[PDB]
């Protein structure tokens, strides 16, 4: 039907407030929930309904700063929340040593991203510490882990690393040559990109791989025209009405962004069917509580609400800012980031 803009604004507001205990499993990634909400409000041009200053302090309290003796550099970045019990400190005093306190790549990413959206200038971010932490996360095969203590490694984190380096406008955070190698090796026989070599290609990892290369400004250099044509074919074949993540799987609203954004980066999103995509996304809209779900008549969540809105944005929905397809923020925010990078270079 129609886009219930105000309802979605309220939905995101509620996400930033208080959640029922049934959402406890999101504790360690509250920062990315904040991202979905903040970036979602930005996308709807409603960042005025929140107190940017309070939220900025909260985010800074999540930064893992180097200790006096700077012996924990390999563990700096941002935490997903305060679940460790470390005393509230909005990046004021130095770091309070803790045996298991370290950053998480997806949190360092969403954290920096949130700060930029809120208008902060990142002056309180220990850029060198974050980059040191990032470097420590890269494996021999070029991919990344989420935390220094060890975790699964895949394309998702390669994208996070790329975004971090891009936002801090410094690529010393990774061995780009090895990352590119990992991305190439993930290409499947069916031409999509998988989480890793040999795995089933997926809409999500294809976005992560392609967006990473675009952020590095090496798409053309890494893939030949023939290769890019094969990838484009794989991606555009994902549309059924809305988009699915892999062949023979049901469509899901969030792919309208994952795959749609990939198509945009490959310059052929314009050749997709807008109406069927838009109609599907809206059919998953929760007209009562707001937000979007993965499927129609399904429960809405911050992730699908945000990506459904970004999916709509790709087709320039009336009332939604244009999303920067590779950075995953509003073009307005990406622009503000350009200014920031400029001001630093002086």
């Amino acid at each position: 039907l129609d886009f219930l803009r105000d309802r979605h604004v309220r939905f995101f507001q509620r996400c930033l407030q208080v959640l029922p205990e049934r959402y406890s499993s999101l504790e360690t990634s509250r920062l990315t929930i904040a991202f979905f909400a903040l970036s979602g409000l930005d996308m709807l041009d409603s960042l005025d309904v929140v107190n940017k200053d309070d939220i900025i302090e909260w985010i800074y309290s999540l930064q893992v700063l180097p200790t006096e003796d700077r012996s924990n550099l390999d563990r700096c970045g941002f935490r997903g929340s305060s679940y460790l019990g470390i005393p509230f400190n909005p990046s004021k005093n130095p770091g309070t040593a803790h045996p298991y306190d370290s950053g998480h790549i997806a949190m360092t990413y969403t954290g920096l991203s949130c700060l930029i959206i809120l208008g902060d200038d990142l002056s309180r971010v220990d850029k060198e510490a974050c980059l040191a932490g990032l470097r420590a996360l890269q494996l021999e095969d070029g991919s990344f882990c989420a935390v220094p203590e060890g975790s699964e490694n895949d394309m998702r984190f390669v994208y996070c690393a790329s975004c971090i380096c891009y936002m801090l406008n410094n690529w010393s955070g990774m061995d780009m040559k090895k990352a590119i190698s990992y991305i190439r090796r993930s290409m499947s026989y069916d031409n999509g990109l998988a989480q890793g070599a040999g795995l089933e290609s997926h809409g999500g990892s294809t976005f992560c791989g392609i967006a990473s290369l675009c952020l590095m400004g090496k798409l053309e250099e890494v893939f030949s025209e023939k290769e890019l044509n094969r990838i484009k074919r794989w991606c555009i074949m994902r549309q059924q009405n809305g988009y699915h993540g892999r062949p023979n799987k049901p469509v899901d609203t969030c792919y309208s962004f994952w795959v749609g954004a990939t198509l945009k980066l490959l310059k052929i999103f314009q050749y997709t069917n807008f109406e069927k995509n838009r109609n599907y996304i809206l059919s998953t809209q929760d007209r009562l509580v707001g937000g979007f779900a993965k499927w129609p008549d399904s429960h809405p969540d911050a992730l699908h609400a945000y990506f459904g809105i970004c999916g709509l944005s790709l087709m320039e929905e009336s009332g939604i800012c244009k999303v920067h397809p590779a950075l995953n923020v509003s073009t307005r925010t990406s622009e503000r980031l350009r200014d920031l990078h400029q001001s630093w270079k002086t």
Binding site: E57, S82, D190, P247, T272
Partner: protein
């Protein structure tokens, strides 16, 4: 030991064995964002978990505490890491931990932390004897679980267990020929064993796929596999393929078949073939057939492909 829902469950703040520890609370500061409300029970377990973590206490009581923390939130990677630290420090029976993680994964097969934990255990034990059967059970509840397939490929490659996988793949393709995960597995097995350079293997595979396509012509997975194993060798280098496909067009048609033909004609044009201008028209004719009636949703895309072929071969 003491279950979280047992009638006789006692908060850690009321347990004698924990009297010496000062619980550590979480603090989100003056204005909390995305704050989750916790029940007394939940906050109590984690207030003590924080205490134990902060002091890096490698005790048996801490080990039992992680069991509760995990029951409350299996997505807390820090808890799993600490539990692994304890598994080592206390030299716990890893075979028992395998039973534990096996149950946890069955209840939460989509959790990243639980699959990572199991992988670390198998690496520690250097024992993959239970893996293939465990994964087959999970794949039995959800044949497309990405975590399961990823773990399966890791186990097979790490301990070289290729012997029966191709047979497993054949079994699953009979259960659901449309499972894209299984077709991916098939290519994974073959390219890591015999490879496809053996003409006898290539022929077996191409023939196998055509048989599957004949059974269910509208299956992107089968068509992607077929194109996948031939595209790099050069589609135009297989004359009998082109004709065999043109013979299916009558009945077993589908947008996947039409698309394949277009790709064959394109490969030909790419290799300065004979009747360049005539081949190009055969292609363009198909692109338009796709756009106007066979794959209309991609109408603008096929037209775009057509225009690309013209401006490149004329």
């Amino acid at each position: 030991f003491l279950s979280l829902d047992s009638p006789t469950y006692v908060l850690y703040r009321d347990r004698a064995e924990w009297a010496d520890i000062d619980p550590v609370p979480q603090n989100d500061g003056p204005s909390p964002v995305v704050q989750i409300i916790y029940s007394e029970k939940f906050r109590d377990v984690y207030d003590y978990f924080r205490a134990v973590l902060q002091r890096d206490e490698r005790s048996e009581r801490a080990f039992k505490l992680t069991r509760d923390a995990i029951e409350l939130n299996a997505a807390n990677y820090t808890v799993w890491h600490f539990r692994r630290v304890l598994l080592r420090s206390l030299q716990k029976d890893l075979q028992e931990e395998m039973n534990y993680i096996i149950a946890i994964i069955e209840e939460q097969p989509k959790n990243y932390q639980v699959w990572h934990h199991r992988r670390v255990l198998v690496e520690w034990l250097k024992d993959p004897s239970q893996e293939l059967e465990f994964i087959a059970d999970i794949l039995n509840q959800d044949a497309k679980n990405y975590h399961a397939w990823q773990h399966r490929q890791w186990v097979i490659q790490e301990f070289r267990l290729w012997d029966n996988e191709l047979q497993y793949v054949d079994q699953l393709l009979k259960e659901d020929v449309r499972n894209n995960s299984v077709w991916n597995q098939r290519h994974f097995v073959i390219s890591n064993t015999t490879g496809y350079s053996d003409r006898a293997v290539l022929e077996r595979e191409v023939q196998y796929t055509l048989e599957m396509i004949k059974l269910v012509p509208h299956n992107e997975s089968a068509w992607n596999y077929l194109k996948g194993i031939l595209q790099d060798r050069g589609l135009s280098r297989y004359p009998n393929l082109l004709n065999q496909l043109l013979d299916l067009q009558p009945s077993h048609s589908s947008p996947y078949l039409i698309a394949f033909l277009v790709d064959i004609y394109e490969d030909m044009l790419e290799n300065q073939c004979d009747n360049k201008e005539d081949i190009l028209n055969k292609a363009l004719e198909l692109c338009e057939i796709l756009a106007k009636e066979k794959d209309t949703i991609r109408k603008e895309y096929w037209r775009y492909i057509g225009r690309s072929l013209q401006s490149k071969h004329s």
